[PDB]
Design a protein around this ligand. Structure first.
Ligand SMILES: CONC(=O)Cc1ccccc1C
Lengths: 300, 237
């Protein structure tokens, strides 16, 4: 069980750690988060009280280094940093733990939600989507745009999601125009899975990471990418059976975790009604269809 | 964006453009079977591809053999249209290729866009207008060439005959649309108007009669009356 200590909390802020969150008041004696489960990526995110504009945060894996948070009063945010001095870190954490100034990662033992939302997400792939190679952790915020978005403006601050475009030469073989547009299996299986992602685990990892950025940061281009990767599977007549079963589990937990009062902006009516009711895979997502119909029947 | 009343004069400017209408591509007759069920029998169609500035009509005849053994024909028909429109542009030298293609039905947009991915500088546009191009099969010579075709075939027509010698392309296009609207609203009356007078002929190579200017005004007025009338006889007004 690992720890992300805080130097201090000089400004009042809601702090998220994965699917949890808690309020910290200005200059409250708060010195971070303990008992973080090892084996999963994590995100720690921030919404200042004064400016609910800009949710931001840091994807990290405590196996990759000792990380702490320190507010920067110049740039005006809570920044993640790595401590290279291992004994300085242990000693600081130990003191904060002795004075009980850390909140405990509040994982219920029956609860596999986080695992289920991050099953295929790996830091190494996150870092290729979020290029900032001098750090072991990755910064994301609400306003960052995606590479595909920029083709339609700062390259360094972009989300490098895999570009998916159904009306593109990559997606449509010369001479198979109708076939490939109405049945995207070629594009799913050969172009993307075999060509680009290499396997379905990497595909599902990007899809899960896009959902998490949409949900935690309201990042619009991430939400576009999540829906695009769902629609490409659902619009393919030929999908490995194991991928269909897993997709159903993946979306089930995403739908289960979504805040009830964010569904209107985070869920695309057209995509979901098509996937659940018109697409090739309309009969293959039993768990997702049941939770969607019981929780958001208005969207449909 | 969409072509509508507000940007109608763009059709007569010097950017090459084509209208594409697919309403006659997939044509059937519906009949009873011996068992009392219903079946369709396809008949020959055509794609109506028209340069509204010049009058050039690239009439691609869709022979019934293209539907043999295929499923979802109304959907195929849109993609067949798009495939045929794309090889026409490819066939054309660059300076003769369109800058825009306007489809008369919105369901043609994605089929044509996908088949034209190789031509990113050709804009595919819908229209808000309710153009009467479906009535092209009420022009006898066009109907005759479609029905007689025994194989796929491209037949070239100037749908303005020689009118551009005397009127502008704005006026020609407005004449054409009026004739086609009339034919679409009451084909029998429309045709009586055009061919009542035995002395006015259709010279072999033209589609419409050789009206004088004054005679075209009489005709044009008689077609407007027909269209107001049938609107009454339909709406009781
Ligand atoms: C103006 O470009 N038109 C063509 O490429 C051939 C054609 C088609 C129909 C009627 C006449 C002609 C010359």
């Amino acid at each position: 069980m690992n720890t992300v200590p805080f130097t201090s909390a000089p400004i009042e802020v809601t702090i998220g750690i994965d699917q949890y969150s808690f309020n910290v008041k200005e200059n409250q004696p708060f010195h971070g988060i303990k008992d973080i489960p090892i084996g999963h990526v994590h995100v720690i995110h921030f919404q200042h009280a004064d400016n609910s504009s800009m949710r931001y945060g840091y994807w990290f894996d405590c196996r990759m280094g000792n990380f702490y948070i320190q507010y920067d009063p110049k740039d005006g945010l809570y920044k993640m940093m790595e401590e290279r001095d291992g004994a300085k870190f242990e000693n600081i954490v130990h003191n904060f733990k002795e004075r009980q100034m850390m909140v405990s990662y509040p994982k219920i033992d029956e609860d596999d939600t986080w695992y289920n939302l991050t099953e295929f997400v790996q830091m190494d792939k996150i870092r290729k989507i979020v290029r900032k190679d001098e750090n072991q952790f990755s910064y994301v915020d609400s306003s960052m745009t995606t590479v595909q978005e920029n083709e339609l403006s700062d390259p360094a601050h972009s989300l490098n999601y895999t570009v998916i475009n159904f009306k593109s030469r990559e997606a449509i073989r010369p001479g198979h125009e109708m076939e490939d547009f109405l049945d995207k299996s070629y594009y799913l299986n050969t172009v993307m899975l075999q060509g680009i992602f290499k396997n379905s685990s990497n595909y599902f990892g990007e899809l899960q990471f896009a959902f998490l950025n949409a949900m935690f940061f309201g990042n619009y281009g991430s939400s576009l990418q999540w829906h695009a990767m769902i629609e490409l599977i659902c619009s393919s007549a030929t999908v490995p059976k194991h991928m269909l079963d897993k997709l159903d589990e993946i979306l089930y937990y995403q739908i289960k975790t979504l805040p009830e009062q964010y569904s209107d902006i985070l869920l695309n009516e057209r995509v979901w009604n098509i996937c659940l009711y018109s697409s090739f895979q309309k009969n293959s997502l039993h768990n997702t269809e049941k939770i969607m119909e019981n929780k958001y029947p208005e969207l449909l | 964006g969409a072509m509508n009343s507000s940007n109608y004069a763009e059709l007569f400017n010097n950017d090459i453009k084509l209208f594409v209408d697919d309403t006659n591509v997939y044509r059937v007759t519906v009949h009873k079977t011996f068992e009392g069920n219903v079946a369709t029998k396809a008949i020959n169609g055509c794609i109506f591809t028209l340069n509204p500035k010049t009058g050039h009509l690239f009439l691609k005849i869709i022979h019934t053999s293209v539907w043999a053994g295929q499923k979802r024909l109304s959907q195929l028909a849109k993609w067949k249209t798009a495939e045929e429109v794309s090889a026409l542009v490819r066939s054309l030298p660059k300076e003769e290729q369109p800058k825009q293609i306007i489809v008369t039905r919105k369901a043609m947009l994605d089929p044509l866009e996908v088949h034209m991915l190789d031509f990113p500088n050709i804009a595919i546009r819908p229209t808000e207008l309710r153009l009467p191009f479906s009535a092209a099969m009420s022009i006898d010579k066009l109907s005759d060439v479609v029905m007689k075709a025994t194989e796929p075939q491209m037949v070239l027509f100037n749908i303005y005959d020689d009118w551009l010698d005397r009127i502008s392309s704005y006026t020609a296009f407005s004449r054409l649309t009026l004739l086609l609207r009339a034919l679409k609203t009451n084909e029998e009356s429309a045709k009586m108007i055009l061919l009542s007078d035995p002395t006015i002929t259709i010279k072999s190579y033209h589609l419409w009669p050789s009206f004088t200017d004054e005679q075209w005004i009489t005709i044009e007025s008689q077609m407007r009356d027909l269209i107001l009338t049938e609107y009454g006889r339909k709406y009781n007004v």
